[PDB]
Amino acid sequence: GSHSLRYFYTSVSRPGRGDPRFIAVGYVDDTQFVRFDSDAATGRTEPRAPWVEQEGPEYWDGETRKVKETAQVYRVDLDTLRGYYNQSEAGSHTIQTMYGCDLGPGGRLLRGYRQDAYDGADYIALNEDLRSWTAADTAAQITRRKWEAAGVAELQWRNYLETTCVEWLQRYLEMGKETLLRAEPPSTRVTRHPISDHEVTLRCWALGFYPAEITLTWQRDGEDQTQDTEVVDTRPAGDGTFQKWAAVVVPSGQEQRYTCHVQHEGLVEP
């Protein structure tokens, strides 16, 4: 799929139990490769995928150095936002950031994004032109001014997303192709679980697939039963792949009238 590199920071203030919690994690597509928890005994950014454990100490030390400095920056953001909203030091509060890049062909950035959140709601957001900011309340307009006068968007965020981000996505891709480019189609199947005299639940399965994207669709002899279909949210297996199912309650027998169809990448046919 349209490849992506993305990072997720989560900053949470623990009052007055000492220092703020911080967690950063990296994803190439739907595969996690790095993490940093400011509570781990290591004090280090760590790998989460095998294919990145080849990168040298310069990487990790380079990475560890950087994400400690980000953590301090967020720690102070907690008390600035607490100040903007007239909130007390007694409350716990959360700051969230996500930034990253979708790869275009020819080694081009296709789309850059970077976006913050305070206490679950939006705050500030880099717009798609990589120059402007969207500020969702008075507070974040204070934040906006400061980053307009500094050129944060075009000078440091545009630049990062248009080169480092892109180049490094292509580096994780190449260094991990045996996994991040392997088509993994869903082992797919149906099961029936009766309900009464009339009824019987048909449940179409789809396990062990990558990436998470998928569609499971029941047809009533040609016609999509959506939205009479119970479709559970795509969920992790634990081994790097995913699983989903959709269920439809049918009058027995009349289930020969029913068929399930699965669209996914790993069902490639040229």
Partner: peptide, 9 residues
């Protein structure tokens, strides 16, 4: 690669 050099809020 992690972004760095963030201007504080």
């Amino acid at each position: 690669k992690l972004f760095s050099g963030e201007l504080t809020k």
